[PDB]
Design a protein around this motif. Structure first.
Motif, PDB file in Angstrom:
ATOM      1  N   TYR A  58      61.750  39.258  42.327  1.00 35.34           N
ATOM      2  CA  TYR A  58      60.307  39.550  42.433  1.00 35.34           C
ATOM      3  C   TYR A  58      59.459  38.327  42.806  1.00 35.34           C
ATOM      4  O   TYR A  58      58.653  38.367  43.796  1.00 35.34           O
ATOM      5  N   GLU A  75      48.363  40.948  43.246  1.00 34.19           N
ATOM      6  CA  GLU A  75      49.219  41.523  42.277  1.00 34.19           C
ATOM      7  C   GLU A  75      48.466  42.466  41.356  1.00 34.19           C
ATOM      8  O   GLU A  75      47.409  42.146  40.840  1.00 34.19           O
ATOM      9  N   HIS A  80      54.622  53.800  37.431  1.00 33.32           N
ATOM     10  CA  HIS A  80      55.642  54.481  38.219  1.00 33.32           C
ATOM     11  C   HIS A  80      56.353  55.495  37.358  1.00 33.32           C
ATOM     12  O   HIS A  80      56.776  55.167  36.263  1.00 33.32           O
ATOM     13  N   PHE A 110      53.335  54.000  43.561  1.00 36.43           N
ATOM     14  CA  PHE A 110      52.743  53.605  42.256  1.00 36.43           C
ATOM     15  C   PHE A 110      51.342  54.169  42.123  1.00 36.43           C
ATOM     16  O   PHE A 110      50.709  54.472  43.137  1.00 36.43           O
ATOM     17  N   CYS A 148      54.319  48.510  35.847  1.00 40.24           N
ATOM     18  CA  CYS A 148      55.027  47.584  36.723  1.00 40.24           C
ATOM     19  C   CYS A 148      54.121  46.550  37.326  1.00 40.24           C
ATOM     20  O   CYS A 148      52.966  46.822  37.633  1.00 40.24           O
ATOM     21  N   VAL A 150      53.227  44.740  40.564  1.00 43.31           N
ATOM     22  CA  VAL A 150      53.401  45.077  41.973  1.00 43.31           C
ATOM     23  C   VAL A 150      52.621  44.144  42.903  1.00 43.31           C
ATOM     24  O   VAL A 150      51.461  43.924  42.707  1.00 43.31           O
ATOM     25  N   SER A 171      51.780  46.462  52.214  1.00 44.22           N
ATOM     26  CA  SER A 171      51.682  47.671  51.412  1.00 44.22           C
ATOM     27  C   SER A 171      50.675  48.630  52.052  1.00 44.22           C
ATOM     28  O   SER A 171      49.949  48.248  52.963  1.00 44.22           O
ATOM     29  N   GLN A 193      59.126  43.862  45.904  1.00 43.84           N
ATOM     30  CA  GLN A 193      57.730  43.735  45.650  1.00 43.84           C
ATOM     31  C   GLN A 193      57.252  44.366  44.341  1.00 43.84           C
ATOM     32  O   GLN A 193      56.064  44.483  44.146  1.00 43.84           O
ATOM     33  N   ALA A 194      58.146  44.838  43.473  1.00 41.86           N
ATOM     34  CA  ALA A 194      57.731  45.357  42.167  1.00 41.86           C
ATOM     35  C   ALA A 194      58.740  44.908  41.102  1.00 41.86           C
ATOM     36  O   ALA A 194      59.942  44.782  41.387  1.00 41.86           O
TER      37      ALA A 194
END
Ligand SMILES: Cc1cc(NCCc2ccc(Cl)cc2)c2nncn2n1
Ligand code: NA
Ligand SMILES: [Zn+2]
Length: 208
Positions: A58, A75, A80, A110, A148, A150, A171, A193-194
């Motif tokens: 990550y 961020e 999720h 998400f 999470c 992300v 994204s 990315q998560a």
């Protein structure tokens, strides 16, 4: 390499995660079809998910995104919901956790609204509900969601009612454009990315 650490209900970290969970419940346009009918949850357990390899994966990607976006990872902490929560917390997000048929294409989705993620715990559209009672509105069976970390980076804004991000983006953001009370949804196209930071075990509560 994954270890799960229980948080005490007395811990400020438990409390701040629970508050995000409860305060982002909304009503859904399906009248509860997918996720059930409820206004709030009974939180049974919140565990921190610790995996050094997955965390490092990550943070490596986060730094790459940051350096491509004026040192700004963008961020977020987002929910999720998936029947694959057990694989996610042990092996990380990857292509097998993508929603191939999503509105923004094949990615990992998400939500800001915990109740949106709740619609996906038993599958797309709530699947056939809980495995024990086949009830999408089951009030007995324990459900799990991930909260999470992300990295959105430069996010492509979509106004709306396995793939790649749009060129020059990291994204996609699904902005709510008719339902005035819905919060945003987000899609990433790289599992790195998560990070699945918190495993939340809960029941939906039957309204009085
Ligand atoms: C749209 C969408 C989808 C989510 N999860 C999908 C989980 C999944 C992936 C693949 C199969 Cl086959 C079943 C279920 C989700 N979580 N929070 C917000 N969203 N929004
Ligand atoms: Na991408
Ligand atoms: Zn059940």
């Amino acid at each position: 390499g994954t270890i799960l650490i229980d948080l005490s209900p007395d811990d400020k970290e438990f409390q701040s995660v629970e508050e995000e969970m409860q305060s982002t419940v909304r009503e859904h346009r399906d009248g509860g079809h997918a996720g059930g009918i409820f206004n709030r949850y009974n939180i049974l357990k919140i565990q921190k998910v610790c995996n050094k390899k997955l965390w490092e994966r990550y943070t490596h990607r986060r730094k790459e995104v940051s350096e491509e976006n004026h040192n700004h990872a963008n961020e977020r902490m987002l929910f999720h919901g998936s029947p694959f929560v057990n694989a996610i917390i042990h092996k990380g997000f990857d292509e097998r956790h993508a929603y191939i048929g999503g509105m923004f294409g094949a990615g990992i989705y998400f939500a800001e609204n915990s109740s949106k993620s709740n619609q996906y715990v038993y599958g797309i559209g709530g699947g056939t509900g809980c495995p024990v009672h086949k009830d999408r509105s089951c009030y007995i069976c324990h459900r799990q969601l991930l909260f999470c970390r992300v990295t959105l980076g430069k996010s492509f804004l979509q106004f709306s009612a396995m793939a790649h991000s749009p060129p020059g983006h990291h994204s996609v953001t699904g902005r709510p454009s008719v339902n005035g009370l819905a919060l945003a949804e987000y899609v990433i196209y790289r599992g790195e990315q998560a990070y699945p930071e918190y495993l939340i075990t809960y029941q939906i509560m039957r309204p009085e």
